[PDB]
Amino acid sequence: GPIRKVLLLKEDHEGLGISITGGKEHGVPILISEIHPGQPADRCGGLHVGDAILAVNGVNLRDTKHKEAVTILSQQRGEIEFEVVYV
């Protein structure tokens, strides 16, 4: 689908509210496999199961290994911009 920019707002006491799967070692993008109810990704409205995460706050995630992506994603705070695509 089209590449989208999506804003997520979160406070420091919570996570993103997603499960991710995939990554470079598996030959696939970082993919959202779950959106957890009532958590920031669900609340933001624009992120969905099946979306590939291309970048977060300008940090490219397309060639990143799974754990690399976890570290990068979990470091982000506050108002967080995602670049995502559903395919």
Binding site: S19, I20, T21
Partner: peptide, 10 residues
């Protein structure tokens, strides 16, 4: 499901 691919809750 298969679960060959790693999954993380974040």
């Amino acid at each position: 499901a298969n679960s060959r691919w790693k999954t993380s809750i974040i």
